[PDB]
């Protein structure tokens, strides 16, 4: 009821995974209220300007996105403050780069170039399935898309392939404990594979215990666990090195090693 | 003005709660509708988020339900008999949640003559005969059917003794279970088994 929303987001109060540089600006781009939650969402303003370097300023981002060149999941996206978070396909039609926003092992978004046929779909984790609104059951995804009349075997925390051109379900992977996963924030964020087991604690905070392909085992809450696949074959193209999470020192050894200049 | 907030009025330690917040509109409360017995007025109130919740002032009519028979009909609210919360409410004839209401009973009864052909209480030779449409409903015939349906019904048809007294007297005990101050309508449970037995003691003691 009370107060806000209050539309002004200060830089430094701004989610760190974006990598906004402190200086030059007191004020953060504040993704408008869309399908993706404000901390988990990569504004079009940061993605075009800071990463892709097509835009120098905020004034340049509104010029490009007004031109309707940034067509996030089947939609023109006129708004430069549009949130566009997880599994979202950003297609810069001229010249053609085709992106999915997926997560770095450092819990940051990546610039990830996907095939133009991979760009057709996307993977949606299902929040909730409820019965009553037209034409009688409906399924709602984490990207707020409601897909009417879901297959009756689709249960909460499953993933669906969405055709995007039409809003249809055209695959579903049951939450079963050897399915390939990418975890979305806890601290374990974009680490990958393969969910050994869940331990259900009734009311609440069901913990999923996950074993990566380095055989390292780690744990996150079920709300953070997104199912993307089958053990071995992920349905979408993962960013390099496949969220394995070494240590920073082991990465330092590999990095230092990799140059003869 | 009128304010919810737990933060007024002495702690359980008796500690003096100082101030902190003027009165906020977050805490808002608003003057009671105090809905009277009479001519059908309903007013919209803008309630937080947007939504109209209806304050009824002056409601004649309600939806009073026979739970046992699973049928509710629209009947005039004749009177307010009792109120457990305040005796002043009875006098002013304000329609409240669980205010005891005496109905009107006439459309209920016509249909239960038309489900059982058992006149519920046992009426009278000119009263049955005089069909507006009493006697026509009773006799019916068509050979055959609807008479056959009355044969099927009635191991159940005896109708509770308390209810039969109330039925022909034309005034039936009920409790309104709606807030016509926020729900804009005055609608009730018709007192059946246990519901009558506690209230009937209260009627004859209080009067």
């Amino acid at each position: 009821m009370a107060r806000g929303p209050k539309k002004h987001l200060k830089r430094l109060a701004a989610p760190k995974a974006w990598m906004l540089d402190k200086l030059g600006g007191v004020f953060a781009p504040r993704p408008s209220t869309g399908p993706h939650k404000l901390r988990e969402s990569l504004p079009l303003l940061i993605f075009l300007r800071n990463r892709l370097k097509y835009a120098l300023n905020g004034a340049e981002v509104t010029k490009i996105v007004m031109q309707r060149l940034v067509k996030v999941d089947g939609k023109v996206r006129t708004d430069p403050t549009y949130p566009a978070g997880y599994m979202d396909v950003i297609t810069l039609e001229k010249t053609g780069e085709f992106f999915r926003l997926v997560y770095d092992v450092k819990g940051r978004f990546v610039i990830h170039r996907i095939s133009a046929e991979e760009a057709k779909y996307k993977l949606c984790k299902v929040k909730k399935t409820q019965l009553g609104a037209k034409g009688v059951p409906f399924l709602v995804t984490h990207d707020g898309r409601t897909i009417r009349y879901p297959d009756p075997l689709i249960h909460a925390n499953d993933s669906v392939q969405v055709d995007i051109a039409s809003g249809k379900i055209t695959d579903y992977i049951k939450f079963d404990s050897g399915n390939l996963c990418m975890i979305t924030g806890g601290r374990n964020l974009g680490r990958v594979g393969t969910v050994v087991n869940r331990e259900r604690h009734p009311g609440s905070f069901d913990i999923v215990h996950i074993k990566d392909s380095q055989g390292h085992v780690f744990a996150t809450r079920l709300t953070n666990v997104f199912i993307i696949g089958k053990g071995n074959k992920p349905y979408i193209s993962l960013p390099k090195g496949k969220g394995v999470k070494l240590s920073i020192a082991e990465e330092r050894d590999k990095r230092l090693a990799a140059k003869t200049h | 003005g009128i304010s919810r907030d737990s933060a007024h009025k002495r702690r359980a330690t008796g500690g003096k709660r100082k101030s902190l917040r003027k009165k906020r509109k977050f805490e808002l409360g608003r003057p009671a509708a105090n809905t009277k017995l009479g001519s059908g007025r309903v007013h919209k109130v803008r309630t937080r988020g947007g939504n109209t919740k209806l304050r009824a002032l002056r409601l004649e009519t309600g939806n009073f339900a026979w739970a046992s028979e699973g049928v509710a009909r629209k009947t005039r609210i004749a009177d307010v008999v009792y109120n457990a919360s305040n005796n002043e409410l009875v006098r002013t004839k304000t329609l409240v949640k669980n205010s005891i209401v005496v109905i009107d009973a006439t459309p209920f009864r016509q249909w239960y003559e038309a489900h059982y052909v058992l006149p519920l209480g046992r009426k009278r030779n000119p009263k049955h005969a005089q069909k507006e449409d009493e006697n026509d409903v009773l006799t019916k015939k068509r050979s055959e059917k609807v008479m056959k349906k009355y044969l099927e019904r009635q191991k159940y048809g005896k109708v509770e003794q308390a209810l039969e007294d109330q039925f022909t007297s034309g005034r039936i005990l009920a409790c309104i279970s709606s807030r016509p101050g926020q729900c804009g309508r005055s609608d009730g449970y018709i007192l059946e088994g246990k519901e009558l037995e506690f209230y009937l003691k209260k009627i004859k003691s209080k009067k």
Partner: protein
């Protein structure tokens, strides 16, 4: 207790027993459905047998007991359908490199399903839909009520 005799006729929302028209009868005389308290918490069987209205009861009422599960000791049984518990614990203050033993005294609703609730009972309480100012809890299990000697009746 009382024969639920208050100025109002005590009824639970949505249960009127239907005598008239709907398929007959196998005994019990009561349409009272009763709970499984389920964080493996077992029901007292007086819930199912309870004439008592209590709308603030999870067993007979439309309420969730939502959230924090805490164990404490009843200090005062005095109130009709509520009890006081004192919980006493060590809070370690690093500065004083020792604790202070500290208390919180909190009122918690005893549904009248729970019988022989007496000071000093160990009781499992759940945070409730916050029920009447100092009463911010409801009893989910009386884990004591007890009398480790008294359970089997002394000669």
């Amino acid at each position: 207790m009382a024969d639920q005799n208050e100025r109002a006729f005590q009824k639970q929302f949505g249960v009127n027993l239907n005598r008239k028209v709907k398929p007959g009868i196998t005994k019990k005389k009561l349409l009272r459905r009763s709970r499984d308290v389920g964080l493996g918490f077992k029901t007292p069987r007086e819930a199912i047998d309870g004439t008592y209205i209590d709308k603030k009861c999870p067993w007979t009422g439309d309420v969730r007991i939502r959230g924090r599960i805490l164990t404490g000791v009843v200090r005062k049984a005095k109130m009709q359908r509520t009890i006081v518990i004192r919980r006493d614990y060590l809070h370690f203050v690093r500065k004083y490199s020792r604790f202070e033993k500290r208390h919180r005294n909190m009122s918690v609703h005893c549904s009248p399903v729970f019988r022989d609730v007496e000071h000093g009972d160990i009781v499992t309480i759940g945070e409730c839909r916050p029920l009447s100012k100092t009463v911010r809890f409801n009893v989910l299990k009386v884990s004591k009520g007890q009398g480790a000697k008294k359970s089997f009746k002394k000669y």
